[PDB]
Design a protein around this ligand. Sequence first.
Ligand code: RB8
Ligand code: RB8
Ligand code: RB8
Ligand code: RB8
Lengths: 416, 413, 425, 406
Amino acid sequence: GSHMKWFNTLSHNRWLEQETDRIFNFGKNAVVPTGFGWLGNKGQIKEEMGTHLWITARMLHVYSVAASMGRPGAYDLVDHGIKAMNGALRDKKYGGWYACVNDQGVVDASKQGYQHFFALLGAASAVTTGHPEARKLLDYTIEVIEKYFWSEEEQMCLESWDEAFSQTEDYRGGNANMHAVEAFLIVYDVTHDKKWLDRALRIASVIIHDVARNGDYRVNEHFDSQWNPIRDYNKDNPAHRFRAYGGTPGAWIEWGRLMLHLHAALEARFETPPAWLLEDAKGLFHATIRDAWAPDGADGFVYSVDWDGKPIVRERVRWPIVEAMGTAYALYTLTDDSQYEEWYQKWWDYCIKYLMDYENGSWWQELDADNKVTTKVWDGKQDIYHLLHCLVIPRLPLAPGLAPAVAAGLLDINAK
Amino acid sequence: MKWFNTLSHNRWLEQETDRIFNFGKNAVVPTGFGWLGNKGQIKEEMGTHLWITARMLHVYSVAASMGRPGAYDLVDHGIKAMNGALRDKKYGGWYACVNDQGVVDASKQGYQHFFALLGAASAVTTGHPEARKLLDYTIEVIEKYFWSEEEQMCLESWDEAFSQTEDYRGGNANMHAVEAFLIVYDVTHDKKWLDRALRIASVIIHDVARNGDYRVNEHFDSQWNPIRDYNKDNPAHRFRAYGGTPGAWIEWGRLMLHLHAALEARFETPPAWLLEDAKGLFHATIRDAWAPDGADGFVYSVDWDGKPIVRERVRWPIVEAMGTAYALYTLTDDSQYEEWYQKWWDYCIKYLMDYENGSWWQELDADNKVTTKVWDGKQDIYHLLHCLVIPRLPLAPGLAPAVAAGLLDINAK
Amino acid sequence: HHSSGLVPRGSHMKWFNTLSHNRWLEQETDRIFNFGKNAVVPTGFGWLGNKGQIKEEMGTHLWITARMLHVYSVAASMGRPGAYDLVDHGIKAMNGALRDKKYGGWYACVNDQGVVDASKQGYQHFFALLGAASAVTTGHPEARKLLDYTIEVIEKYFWSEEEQMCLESWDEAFSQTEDYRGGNANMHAVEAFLIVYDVTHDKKWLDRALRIASVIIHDVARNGDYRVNEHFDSQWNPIRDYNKDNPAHRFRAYGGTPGAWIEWGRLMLHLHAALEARFETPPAWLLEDAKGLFHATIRDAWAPDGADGFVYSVDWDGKPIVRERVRWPIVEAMGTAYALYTLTDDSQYEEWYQKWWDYCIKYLMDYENGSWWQELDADNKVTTKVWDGKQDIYHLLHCLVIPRLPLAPGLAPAVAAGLLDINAK
Amino acid sequence: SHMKWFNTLSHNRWLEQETDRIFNFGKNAVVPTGFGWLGNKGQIKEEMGTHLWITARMLHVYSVAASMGRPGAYDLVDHGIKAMNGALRDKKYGGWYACVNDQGVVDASKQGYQHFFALLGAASAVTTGHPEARKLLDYTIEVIEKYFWSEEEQMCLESWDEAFSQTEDYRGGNANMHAVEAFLIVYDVTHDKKWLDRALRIASVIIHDVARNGDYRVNEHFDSQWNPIRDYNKFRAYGGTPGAWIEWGRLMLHLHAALEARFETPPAWLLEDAKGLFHATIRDAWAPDGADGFVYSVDWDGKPIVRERVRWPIVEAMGTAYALYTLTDDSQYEEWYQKWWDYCIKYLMDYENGSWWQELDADNKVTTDGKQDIYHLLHCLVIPRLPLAPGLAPAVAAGLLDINAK
Ligand SMILES: O=S(=O)(O)C[C@H]1O[C@](O)(CO)[C@@H](O)[C@@H]1O
Ligand SMILES: O=S(=O)(O)C[C@H]1O[C@](O)(CO)[C@@H](O)[C@@H]1O
Ligand SMILES: O=S(=O)(O)C[C@H]1O[C@](O)(CO)[C@@H](O)[C@@H]1O
Ligand SMILES: O=S(=O)(O)C[C@H]1O[C@](O)(CO)[C@@H](O)[C@@H]1O
């Protein structure tokens, strides 16, 4: 009919900032002596879940952004995060970080690559605040990543180890490798050591440009030690929180945004990006809508699909649509194609209608196939890190990345 | 009195910038850029110099990003010249000087090769389709012959065939290496270019200059020991003056503040000596070389006691001083730096700016009357961007990248 | 839609919507305004030569007088002292010696002694309409009365309700109309109607503009590979061979005039933008055909003969006939590049704009004698063949002012509404 | 429609570029004793010597140029301050000789109107922060308070002999008007309210009492008891100088704006009388004789006497149009400003020989002593780019150029 304009309007960006403050305030209750706890549906700590590395590292990242946004108390949460990464979570005998601890000791002693890449992101985002211990934490995290999680032999990321780093898992994961790309982008932004961007491009070339593109942009996540897909992985456990059977369309559209951050990093240094970053980001965006948007007679993104693109887990988890909104912004920024803003607007309307929770705080984690609140895949409201991708990313250029851009004063730079 | 970051001052700067861009256009010759005389006509006897051709490529890259019609054509002409008669097809790199008949000076001058690197890196910011290929080639030549991994410093020069390197190491060539490396960093975001820049500055400024009351030693032997008496018999050399060249001291200061700004832009604490030594160089330049002989202006050279030797006021030292005043003001907010900038602007319009014949005079005598002694014509406009465009831009990224990124007047109201 | 003639680029050099480029444009605009001021004569605006002197032998043309009224309306809204006096002079000339007191409308040409050419030229009357509508944006107290009069003349003699198209010309007495229908007159009708719409919001002006474009572009031009047919008989059938014996005509060249093709493109994008400004989805053929015209203009007329520049005319196979580089075609091309960039965000249109700007300063701009050359030979050296002097500055606002403004409302309205550099940083 | 110029960046860019043309013309006036008298080709007329009023005005002009970021301007401020501390300065009796040259004193008289320009020049120079400016202002204030501001009359005196032994048996609107102009800027660089109190008092006597009661025809010539001399001279034209009427209007609006800037309700008569003066100036002096332009003087019936179009009256009219527009938002004031700009480029501006003509005949053709002033031109070139408070030099120094423009 005509173009309703939200992107780069101060009116929309004011609404985003005020929702951002609501989300920052919800996450503050997660402070526990050993790091950040697991928030439930009323913003209370679920003490039985203990202190997870992935949640502690994500909150360190989140409050780095909040601190650069000039929020009192955020810097204290960054300081608390860095103390936790130097304290109870840190394995003093073998190095790196336990997956989960509590006041009594270690709950899960395993060394999870997924969670270590979030440690790297958290440390790199914390660097943007100039916290005096942030750069030392990043340098240590880099040594752990290069010793145990980045393989020079495979030129890809490993998945996990036992406590003692004696045996690595006979498995390679798209999820851990995707969050490696995310962390590497920010490590690049705070080092300009080229190898971080080279590693990110290489990971995307293998998982997206080779495997995903050849399967109609259905991202394969599960691989053996020779980087062959395991198509049947977790067939008996399809609703796994991190390793769902088949395809996780939320992850496809997230890969898209990350490859546009890579594209934008190359353009920021006056370098023509390879054409496949934008072509594949478009392919992933359109595949996500083709297979996973309202495929079953109601609005929303399903959690998982088979290799034919037919839904398996039909629950609407929060993070897939949040990532979709981030990618819509990134594609709009690089194409000026108004279809991407229309999707962003449609998804915002769905989010306030079904996911946003003004009564109990933050957003619901999970809805059923009719978009009614449920508990099946998940349990509580333990994450706010994804929400910055629909609340803060649309206020920033695509280079440098989220925490660096906010710290460089770039919030609303393109808005009038 | 407020000039820095005012649109009124920056409008005056842009209008003078257009006058300078217009003057340089007449330097176009088939083999690159010629040597302009005092009326902006080509001095054909000087032929086509690599340093002038590379500098004009840089200048018209900035002009093109400023939206000036014709500038991009000059960028195109510059890149063709760097792929044409100046390029040594047998041994690689570039001849120092050519003309329409062939090679005039076949030597491989590091000073001039670092300007080739700056020119190629600035040209990349225009997106000219051959710029990146020229930069990649220039990088290979620099890393093969001019950056020494053994010394972690820049060599000076070679014969045509790259068979023997000069038994000499130079502050001047190493300073213009730092200048080029900053822009290579801005168009690669490969930290090794900034690591090299920091290392060069640590040796020439933080070690030697600081220990001599910030009187920069420029002349070294192959083991990086100072030759204090170098060119005693030829004190007014255009590139290697006897003793200290205070214009170079204050220029080193600005370059170290660009390095500082690059490190802060990626959330890295710059070493404290970049700002401390930039201040030391700025104050030493004023102490020894500003009105040291009973009249305003910066002398060309001083002895190791800081007393003038060549008392002629060459154009580029005061232009560089004005750039450094801006950079120090930007990092300190100390209004003494703006006072110096304003005082130097008043001197420049009174004695150096030439509205009748175009551009600025290259050289004045000890009473600030136009002269010919050290120099001959108006062959440079590259230095003028440091007092005309730099004060309109942040210190990171560098000049050509910042203009191309839309940052002109970003801090002004 | 991709044309030959650009080397692909490694990064985006940004000029459009930069205050640095727009400052360069404004300073060139002031140089052009200053050149036109010497054209003031008692009966209107004279014909300026290569040194900015009046060529008195050419007398006072309606088309030049009406164009200068339009130009100084823009200058007046830009806050230039003296411009409003030239608008006042223009309106007095349109109410004085040029005006036919017996039959109405305006003589084509007068001088201090009387009428030189008494004919009633539609081409020139549509410039009278544009001039009056642009003058309205200044609020000159006689402008609205001049527009109302001009509208009456246009609706009586030049817009045909029967054909739903514009007629070409009449004798002095409006007794017989020319056995000819012209793309050129109809194109400048569209241009004028856009501005009449902007100062009336009487829908019929935009309806008439859309209708004219639907016939000359969407029907005839599109079916001939976007080679605009300009010459028609009274039944609107093409006369393909028109002026075969007089191929270098200043207004009615034999075959196709690619400058006019790319100009049609920009006008259709002003029409598109007028519809979007009132929250109405424009028909898709306005943008599709503007792209077709832009790419056809480059295909047939850009550097077809071993040197840069736009040739004046091509035959129906796209073979150049008049190879001289006249000023206005590349100026219009630059305007259309801006309009297409604004609606597509396709950087190929900015690259063409930048390439054409580089050509203009190299070969057309005349800093020594003033303004720009009117005409170059096939090697881009100054010549005299099609034209004679520097009688026009109206086209130059399309590459100097249009790139500083939104596409709606039109040129004079947008400047008067404070929109200069609204999108620039 | 309204054609919009005021507060548009497009118009203000045209104004700044003309301002630079005017700054460049004045630079040739530098002589060792101060600022010389420029002729019609921008050459020094050496026979005219160094006038106090011209030297003080150029000090003011290059203070504005220096705050505008023009290289060379600050050197001219420094030169101006040195001239006010050198040969112009009476070392024996204090204040400044009216005219000197390289050899010595040409006119030793102590002219009030020229001393108030010395005060304006010193106050404008203070806004540059030149280290000798404040000392020059403090000295100038002492001379003004000793000899030119009368605590007894609460008005300004006109002139004295060299030795300050006898004051002239005359009181003038012109000296008192330029006192108001200087006092406004002294207020802006001291925030001592007494300068604004004195300005309001001067205006209350010359405008609110006498001018208002005579249909806003300002009486300029008074005896020592401040009674009008209507017949005087059957700088001191017989009858009314309408240029001065409209100038008084702008100055009272600067006074109004200074009071509003410190949250003080200005008396209603400042705006009412500025409007009265503006409309009286149009009524009697705009195109009163069959051709465009402002005549120089009129009789007490408002009929022209001296029909020459001098440059400064229309320049001041343009300043007042801006000030009235700023306080009323009445577009009639912008229409007058636009009409006067069109007249100025057509008849006064001289692109061939530089600057503007000083004087035209009754048919607006140039007529027959040079182009010795550029100070008035800032009132139509810079004032329309600034708020009405603080005043011209302070506002530019505070970064307020184009603050209201888009
Ligand atoms: O954010 S949570 O929803 O609590 C955890 C999810 O983050 C992802 O890696 C998405 O990229 C999922 O695999 C996790 O379940
Ligand atoms: O620019 S010129 O004056 O032509 C040359 C000077 O540039 C410098 O390297 C300064 O950075 C001098 O040594 C050259 O003479
Ligand atoms: O502007 S001029 O070159 O003098 C006249 C041209 O304008 C056109 O109508 C193009 O739109 C041509 O037909 C005229 O020759
Ligand atoms: O500026 S000049 O025209 O040279 C001098 C005039 O200034 C006034 O004081 C106007 O306010 C007049 O009395 C002078 O003649």
